[PDB]
Amino acid sequence: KCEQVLIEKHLEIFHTEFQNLLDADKNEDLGRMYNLVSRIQDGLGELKKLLETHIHNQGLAAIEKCGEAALNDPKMYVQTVLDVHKKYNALVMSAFNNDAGFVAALDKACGRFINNNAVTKMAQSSSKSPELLARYCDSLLKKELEDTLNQVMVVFKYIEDKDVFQKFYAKMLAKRLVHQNSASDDAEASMISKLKQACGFEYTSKLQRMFQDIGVSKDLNEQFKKHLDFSIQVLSSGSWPFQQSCTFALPSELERSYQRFTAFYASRHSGRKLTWLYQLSKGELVTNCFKNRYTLQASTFQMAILLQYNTEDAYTVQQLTDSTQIKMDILAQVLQILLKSKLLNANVDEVELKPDTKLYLGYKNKKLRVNINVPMKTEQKQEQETTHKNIEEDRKLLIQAAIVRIMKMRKVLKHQQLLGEVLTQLSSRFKPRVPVIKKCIDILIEKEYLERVDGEKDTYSYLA
């Protein structure tokens, strides 16, 4: 009775106060109000709805505040998201006493405004969040820190698109393994152990396969050096996401290493060759003609281009093209980087490279050893869309395989049930669309996998 006279009659008056207590940080007031409203029956749904609305509004405001910066900066956005998530979690635990019905509200709210936000609208795709997460993870892994990994793992559960994130993480791990610049093995082991619980088993098996492949490369290299300033990695194309290297002619000084090792391979393995890759290769050269000795690192194409400067002063781009065998786009991309490096006009950036057009005696730097290998200006975007297309193709193939295996078991299945089985079987990975699932049935049908039953359409049967 008392609860009906001191709380019930004024519930509306309390409601307007709730928002007033959310704008300003007052944990004691929220706790007292929750304790008061707990005694009342069916009087908590409105509070949960208001809390969810406030959480969504605050998240949208935070994401919009850092607009036009989160697209290429996966650090600040992730930091803000984690800070907001932890703040809300602490507020719920302390004020609401970690109520069962309130933790779900925050979970659904996060799952709602993480996928869709200003970044998603600007990028015109919901896969930007996993991309930023993968980039941030790679940044942390590449050169006390376990707290961030746990935060990323717990917040990652709200991400619906997991295949894109897994593919990006695999690509980053492969890139880091190819170019040895990792921080420590303990961090990698901890990350693998943490991902074992979240990700499935195929991903872990592939990562272990890559690890053993690189180990075999390392011990083969050490055995080769023992048998005899030259290290080459031998990896498997099937278990590593790398494409075939384009046409390229080896220089003179590097020819010897290409021959002897090949012979060493002939006596070790038969029926298999090696596909040398140069886009990922690197080297180092030393010069002394300057006022001081310089020890600089570069890529294979860069050393090949420079190594043409013996017995010459200046060149034409075409002789370069016909002597180095490099495509015009890559040749121009390398040449503009070299010009920016002040190693080879009014202005170097954004100046046309005209096939008709030497090294300048300069490049005065305080550091004895200087690294010039840097990512290209546009290769990042090209890699982005090509990886996105590959992921889309893999998703389509996986959907086709799932449909085929579902229909194999059932001799004759309805069209409606078939789309529920496909959605529920792959829901853990992604949420395929219905316009997208339709095409695949047609392609399967076009390839004689299935037959719409003769009596009526929208019933499919499996015919061998």
């Binding site: 080459i232 031998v234 498997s236 180092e284 050269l285 002394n288 420079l306 389509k396």
Partner: protein, 88 residues
């Protein structure tokens, strides 16, 4: 006119079977080129989805060719064992 020397070098290479990489065992056409099923007709909507499928045995096989071969016999004809998909 300058002296440019090299001290060390790092390279990356990939190993694969020659007999399968140079030409697919099922289809005698070039792997990069369209398959026989895709070459017979070009207006079909399935002509842009034929790609190279790899496996544990590091063998290259066309997607359509391997899919059709898996109907009757599931063991790979080269190593005589269970074929598995790794990438495309």
């Amino acid at each position: 006119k300058k002296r440019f020397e090299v001290k060390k070098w790092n390279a990356v290479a990939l190993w694969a079977w020659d007999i399968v990489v140079d030409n697919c065992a099922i289809c005698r056409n070039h792997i990069m080129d369209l398959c026989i099923e895709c070459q017979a007709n070009q207006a079909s909507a399935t002509s842009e989805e034929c790609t190279v499928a790899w496996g544990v045995c590091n063998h290259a096989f066309h997607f359509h060719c391997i899919s059709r071969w898996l109907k009757t016999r599931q063991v790979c004809p080269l190593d005589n064992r269970e074929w598995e998909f790794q990438k495309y």
